[PDB]
Each structure stands twice: as C-alpha cells, then as structure tokens.
From TrEMBL:
It comes from Escherichia coli. It catalyses: a beta-lactam + H2O = a substituted beta-amino acid. Signal peptide: none annotated. Belongs to the metallo-beta-lactamase superfamily. Class-B beta-lactamase family. Monomer. Coiled coil: none annotated. This is beta-lactamase. The chain holds residues 41 to 269 of 270 of the full protein. Zn(2+) 2 binds at residues 84, 168, 210. Zn(2+) 1 binds at residues 80, 82, 84, 149.
Length: 229
C-alpha cells in the first residue's frame, strides 16, 4: 500500500500486516503537530493502536481501513490520556469497536475532557498486561514501563514482527528534546524508557508519536536525555 494520503491523514506500510497512521493538529500560529499510531491486520480482523487527534480524523482511519483492508476492526488500544491518543474515542464507539486503555488512563480521561475506553487494563508487577484484562489481543503485547511522558503511558509490541510502539515515551535518536513534558514524571522517565527496551529486546523498528520509525538508538538516546532531567 506504500505511503498514502487519505483524507487529512497519511498511512505508511511498515510491514506486510502493519501500517502507521498519521494525523495532524493545527495549533493556530505554529502549524501542524503530527501524531502516529498503528493499524494491525491480525488474520481476518484489524487492531488499532491509538486514535487520531479528533473524532473526524479517527472516522477517516476507519474509512481507510474499509477501503484498503476491508476487514472488521475488532478492538483498539490507546496508550495514554492525551488528545493525540484518545481524542477520537467517540468515533470508535459509534462504529461498535471495543476499546481498551490502562485503568489510570480511563480515570484521567474525563478530567482532560476526553472519553474513557470501555475496558480497563491492569498490569502485573513485571509490567506485562494481566491477560484476563486483555482478552483476544492476539499479537498485541501490552507493557507498562513505568511513568515517563505521563504516569499512565503504555507501550505495545507486535508479535510476529520486529516492531514495538513507544508512543510519546520514546523519541528518535537525533531528537533535541523529550517532547511535551507538561504531565511528565521527570524522576522516573529514564528507567521507564530503558524498561520499554528491555521488554521488547528483539524489536529493531521503534515506532513513536511524533517522528518516523527508528532503530533501537531511539531508546538509548531517549534514556540518556531523560538521565539529564
Ligand atoms: Cl511527546
Ligand atoms: Cl521483543
Ligand atoms: Cl517523537
Ligand atoms: Zn501525551
Ligand atoms: Zn507526544
């Protein structure tokens, strides 16, 4: 499917069954902020990681899925309670899609003027999602690395691929900053970035919220910036 413009979004194929979705927030005076999530074809169903910034943009994701894949969307997982990741929850719910987030994300969501997911994930002491809370996730491997970008940030690996999703936790290997630290846990950030690397040690493609996918150098670089906080 390549790189493709569809509506106001960009879709980029990462692997035979994995695509990155990109949507943009206009901040009047400063132009457009990209946010990336994922689309996974898991057999005869589709799995979404993160919404777009808005309901309309998130409906465009669903329309692209219908046009390009023509398989039903079984579920979505959202990686923390900010607008770039949970802005479009209502569009998923209107389409009848089961939604999942960290229990703490669902507690924070309404306080940040957003809609909670339907289901709450909980995590073992080692950071892996408790399987009873993540029924039928298939290849999606969900990990809580500890607080960093936010207290609630979660991360996802895709079994059967070399791909892991750091979302807003991880920055690219040439980044000059850690991005948006408005809600960050600066004391815990470095260890949480390293914990994400340790959870997905065979990943060679690191997908993140506001940069193109990178090597494992993204993880090291992120942790080293966070060591200076
Ligand atoms: Cl960020
Ligand atoms: Cl791995
Ligand atoms: Cl980024
Ligand atoms: Zn965020
Ligand atoms: Zn971000």
């Amino acid at each position: 499917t390549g790189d493709q413009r569809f509506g106001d979004l960009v879709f980029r194929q990462l692997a035979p069954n994995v695509w990155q979705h990109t949507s943009y927030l206009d901040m009047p005076g400063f132009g457009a902020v990209a946010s990336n999530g994922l689309i996974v074809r898991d057999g005869g169903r589709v799995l979404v990681v993160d919404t777009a910034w808005t309901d309309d943009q998130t409906a465009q994701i669903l329309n692209w899925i219908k046009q390009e894949i023509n398989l039903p969307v079984a579920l979505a997982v959202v990686t923390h309670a900010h607008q770039d990741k949970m802005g479009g929850m209502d569009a998923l719910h209107a389409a009848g899609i089961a939604t999942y987030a960290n229990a703490l994300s669902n507690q924070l969501a309404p306080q940040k003027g957003m809609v909670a997911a339907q289901h709450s994930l909980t995590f073992a002491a080692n950071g892996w999602v408790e399987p009873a809370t993540a029924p039928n996730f298939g290849p999606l491997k969900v990990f809580y690395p500890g607080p960093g970008h936010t207290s609630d940030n979660i991360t996802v690996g895709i079994d059967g691929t070399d791909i892991a999703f750091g979302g807003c936790l991880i920055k690219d290997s040439k980044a000059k900053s850690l991005g948006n630290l408005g809600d960050a846990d600066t004391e815990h950030y470095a260890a949480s970035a390293r914990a994400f690397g340790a959870a997905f040690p065979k990943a060679s493609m690191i997908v993140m919220s506001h940069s193109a996918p990178d090597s494992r150098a993204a993880i090291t670089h992120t942790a080293r910036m966070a060591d200076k906080l």
